[model samples]
Target: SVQTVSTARGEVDCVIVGAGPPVLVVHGSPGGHDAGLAMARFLVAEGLRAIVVDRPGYFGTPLGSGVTPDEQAELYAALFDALGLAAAGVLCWSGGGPSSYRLAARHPDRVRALVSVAAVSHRYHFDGEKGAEKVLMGTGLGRRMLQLMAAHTPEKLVSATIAAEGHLSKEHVAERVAQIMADPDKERFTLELAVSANHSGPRKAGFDNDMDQFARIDSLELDRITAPTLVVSGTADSDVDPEFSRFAAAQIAGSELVHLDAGTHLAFWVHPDSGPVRRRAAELLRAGG
Candidate 1:
């Protein structure tokens, strides 16, 4: 169930999944608690509880709750207090990276471990969607078309999605798309993530805020993080760039980087190696408890 807790910073909307050691599940831009819940499904299967939240300006959380990453980090600290949790493993994805990174940096004791999956780590700019793709993703009519395509020609939709998200060549895209489509779990997760990128209603505010704030960031003080850190990235990820993870691994003391060769931004959740990778994350997060 999704609940609202009043924190020192503001009220936070979240849902708890499972009943084991807890991991803070932070979602990407244009996402909300529902997006987090989808990611949490795997963690729950791995025997860990997930504290999935709608960050400020998304879903049940309002834009005035916390705008900057630092403020957002502080809000999380407050969330821990409100939830009566001392520390938790941090799992952040994509645009969720900035605030989660700051949480470890500014409040190291509050984070037991940090796992960043294809997350942004430095100054960045979104290469906005172009032409027809932009219209399809940004408008209601386009979203309906997307829905129809998802229901009828799912393989084609998946192909288009993989092509747009990574820097892979046409041949590589076809190979990966074919592989994903053949796997039920991977294909479902891929479609779920794609559907989660709705830039309407509550998501639009946070999505715009993320693009604005992420572009202005110079650093996230990775060196300040004292928790055990794991940086996972896809070599072919065009959304957040693999270099972000490389830099994070370089700056954070005792941190490790895992490269998913020719993987896309969705690699952590859908790649063939995802099982072992997620298991490793579960082990690290369990250590926090």
Candidate 2:
């Protein structure tokens, strides 16, 4: 069943199912409650109460003037209170990983465990590092010119550019774009909007004022987080470098790292039918390993 919980930012719709310890699923940027909902459904089948939250500016939550991750942390705390959940395990994906990490770091007692999938915790400052940025630049000046063209074009035009990038065939790119555009989910556009808003408002505030500070906050300062963390990443993930997971595992004491072969950034949640990825996540959460 879905319950609406009001907070300072706005009201969030949460699905509470099953009985026993709770698990909260926090979705990555540009996504709303659907991603969390999907994960919750899977968790419910596993016999656990899975609480899914629609972060501010997504789903039922109103678009705030601006909301930083720290502000989000406070809102999340309030949501837990509203739900009467004394403690819960956290599962964060992609950009949402930082927010969940902040919650665990700041409110250690409130969380029993953590799962970060393709999490982005490291800073991506361009300082002569061989990171994803370098990979993009290495595509050569012609590709850079194409990227510039893609940047200013409309969504339809951008799809053509993505197709031309040759990452996937023209047919595949067209099919994926069509599916996204046709999705009826309320938070369907959250990811696109979130990406656009990153240069402004709370995202800009967080990136400019707080990102560096948070990036510097490695596992040492965060080691107080007693929750056993499971770090999942795809070896083929180019969005957030896989090394970030390695770095996270090395720093977070008692954390387990699982690298899925041939897994892409969105492989775990997007392609849950994949045997290895789902099995690993379920096994870790079930075994508490």
Candidate 3:
């Protein structure tokens, strides 16, 4: 069942699938609820309720809703209210990392445990140059301009985004693609995910805001997270370096790390280790439930 969480926020799309422990699935740049829905299917099949939503500026959420990670975190709180949930495990993907961490920090009571998948836990820079700020700052207008430009070609814009981060070699993407070719069900799922990504250009602004905000996030804030957080990362990730997760596990007290060796940039989604990866995260989610 999916609908605007007008019961919680004025205009946020909330998709609820299944009926068990509520785990929020927050998508990354160039993504929305459709991609999240496919991911949720896996959890729902395993007996867990999934709350998948398009973050601010993505699909159902207005573009100008929340530009900063802190603001985005508030959106998650509102989602919990819409679901009448007191706390849930937060599953953040890629760029969704910072906002998930902020959710834990800003509203400690709302998060049972936190999980990140190939997530960007710290700041990011063009060409590894550097990486959040509050109240949108000056970067807010920059995001507006980017969405304006991307409105011309959302698919083209998102296509470039997947390749922008040199997290894996061509061989890596090719390998994953080949695996999809070998399996029809997986192929259909992946194709549907790709189609859902640009179905309405909801990611245009999210991709921009995340890149800018993630780069400016304070390391101190990450360390302040007290949830039973678990971080998963591929050793060969192109955008999010394996060392980044290493650094994150260090900062976050009692954090567990699921290191997938020889995994590529899309490892979280396509690699053989994905099963173990999700298993570990599920264990953490049900650990204290």
Candidate 4:
């Protein structure tokens, strides 16, 4: 379970696990503290203290508290100050990428290194997707599918939908999708991580907000993020195109870009336990500290 605190900014919720060089895990949309904690545990097993926090509009935080990415970063800053974390590394996933950019750009002193996994760094809008996607996202099957989450748990559905996030006209890695279907452990992980958001109420608000903000977000000016950054994306990932990582690497000086040949939106889940991604991240944070 996670915890909450009412700070000067707004209500913030988080969970800190283990103890070592600190890593802040900011979760994606359709998620909460459970999402953060999941990533935290992964970081923990790798010998780093993980601080996971639910982005605004999910779990304990009010929907309107940190509507924009900048506001969300400010809330994170306040929470860090209250908890006495002088500096930490950051891992951003999916829709969580924008706020991580804000944190690294605006509060350079707080973050040592940053990693973005299958993240939406650019605008993702309904206009860009298909009419079928539009229907599913709104009054169509998307609502019905999301509604069935409580009963059947929309884990597979979420993964499948995210797996389809390729350019509307593009074809994703069919082989990876087949592999995901065949692997029980990977499917189990997909379901578990997606289902973690069930702790909160219906995801309508959170989903809508994440999309709205991401669609209209101002430039993150990734060039401003002085911390060492790693942008991980998969050629097979449907949700966040490989171009997202490409754009990030181009913007952020000296950022390392990792591409998984057969990975999906959940690529980080299958990355090697002691992969170079976080190891480099740890080295950067430690050196600066």
**Best of the candidates, TM-score:** 1
TM-score of 4: 0.79
Per-model CA lDDT versus the true structure = 0.86, 0.58, 0.68, 0.70
TM-score of 2: 0.63
lDDT of 4: 0.70
Candidate 4: misplaced stretches above 4 Å? 127-187, 196-202, 271-289
Global CA lDDT computed for model 3: 0.68
Count of clashes, each model: 0, 2, 5, 2
lDDT (tens digit, per residue) of candidate 1 on 58-145: 9888777799988899999999999899999999999999999999999999999999998888888987888887777777777677
Pairs of colliding residues, candidate 2: 30-190, 30-191
Clashing pairs in 3: 131-215, 131-216, 132-216, 132-217, 167-238
Clashing pairs in 1: none
Candidate 4 minimal-lDDT segment of 10 residues? 165-174
Ranking by lDDT: 1, 4, 3, 2
Following a full C-alpha superposition, what root-mean-square deviation does model 2 have from the true structure? 8.5
Candidate 4 per-residue lDDT over residues 29-72, each given as its tens digit: 76777667766555676577877887777766777668888888
Candidate 3 at residue 112, lDDT?
A: 88
RMSD of each: 1.5, 8.5, 6.9, 4.4
